[PDB]
């Protein structure tokens, strides 16, 4: 199946997934002077008190942490958003060196890594119907940098030896989500799709202008996870990222001057 190596990456995906040749695809280049100011689009709404984190699991593509998402608990609204997008995961992309990681990028430039909180439409009910929608899901991208630690990420980190290997998980609950964010909740915004497979074209884009910085220790436990499954040739989890694609007939909208 798809992943990362030579033989089963980003340019192969395309033949048992089409749609990654398709018309909104993700991630993007952010061109910062390109993309244009909207003063129509609202501050983002992001409302993470009541967040009920479950497990963390290693699914052998990233690690994501999961919500319980089947109550108004965890909700993302406003921005470019109509209606009321609930928490459902979060998981990271990153690199083999702190230069890249990063799915989307800014004016070419790569982060470390991109974390991922992963939401979808209440109207739909549930997110395997989400994904079939153009406006299903919500993705909140967040950029790494390499520097000072982020505290909020540490209980994530010291729970990842406990998942090295492809299938593994373990409770993890009480996490609050709100400890990864930044300052600002400025944004650009664009449609696009699942940065995996299966590439679906239903995701509402928002991607925060100001990266979180990590430490190079935190950075250093993401690498030490395994693509393989216990029992297989050990491949580090490391480049597990989609390259930019082609904006094709997109404009990215700025939610700041
Ligand atoms: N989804 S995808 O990137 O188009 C893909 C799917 C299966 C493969 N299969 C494969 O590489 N099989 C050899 C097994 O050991 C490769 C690429
Ligand atoms: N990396 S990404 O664009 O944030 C992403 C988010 C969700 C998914 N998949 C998902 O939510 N599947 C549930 C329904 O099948 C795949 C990729
Ligand atoms: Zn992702």
């Given at each position: 199946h798809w992943g990362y190596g030579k033989?089963?990456?980003?340019?192969?995906?395309?033949?048992?997934?089409?749609?990654?040749?398709?018309?909104?695809?993700?991630?993007?280049?952010?061109?910062?002077h390109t993309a244009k100011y909207d003063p129509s689009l609202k501050p983002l709404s992001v409302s993470y008190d009541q967040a009920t984190s479950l497990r963390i699991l290693n699914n052998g593509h990233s690690f994501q942490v999961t919500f319980d998402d089947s109550?108004?608990?965890?909700?993302?609204?406003?921005?470019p958003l109509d209606g009321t997008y609930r928490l459902l995961?979060?998981?990271?992309?990153?690199?083999?060196?702190?230069?890249?990681?990063?799915?989307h990028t800014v004016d070419k430039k790569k982060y470390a890594a991109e974390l991922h909180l992963v939401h979808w439409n209440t109207k739909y009910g549930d997110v395997g119907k989400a994904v079939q929608q153009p406006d299903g899901?919500?993705?909140?991208?967040?950029?790494?940098?390499?520097?000072?630690?982020?505290?909020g990420l540490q209980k994530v980190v010291d729970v990842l030896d406990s998942i090295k290997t492809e299938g593994k998980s373990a409770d993890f609950t009480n996490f609050?989500?709100?400890?990864?964010?930044?300052?600002?909740?400025?944004?650009?915004?664009?449609?696009?799709?699942?940065?995996?497979?299966?590439?679906?074209?239903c995701v509402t884009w928002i991607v925060l202008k100001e990266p979180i910085s990590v430490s190079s220790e935190?950075?250093?436990?993401?690498?030490?996870?395994?693509?393989?499954?216990?029992?297989?040739?050990?491949?580090?989890?490391?480049?597990?990222?989609?390259?930019?694609?082609?904006?094709?007939?997109?404009?990215?909208?700025?939610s700041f001057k």
């Open positions: 033989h089963n990456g980003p340019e192969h995906w395309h033949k048992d997934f089409p749609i990654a040749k398709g018309e909104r695809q993700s991630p993007v280049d952010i061109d910062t109550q108004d608990k965890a909700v993302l609204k406003g921005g995961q979060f998981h990271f992309h990153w690199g083999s060196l702190d230069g890249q990681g990063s799915e899901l919500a993705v909140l991208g967040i950029f790494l940098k390499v520097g000072s630690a982020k505290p609050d989500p709100r400890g990864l964010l930044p300052e600002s909740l400025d944004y650009w915004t664009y449609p696009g799709s699942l940065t995996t497979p299966p590439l679906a074209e935190q950075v250093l436990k993401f690498r030490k996870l395994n693509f393989n499954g216990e029992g297989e040739p050990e491949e580090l989890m490391v480049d597990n990222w989609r390259p930019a694609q082609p904006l094709k007939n997109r404009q990215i909208k700025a």
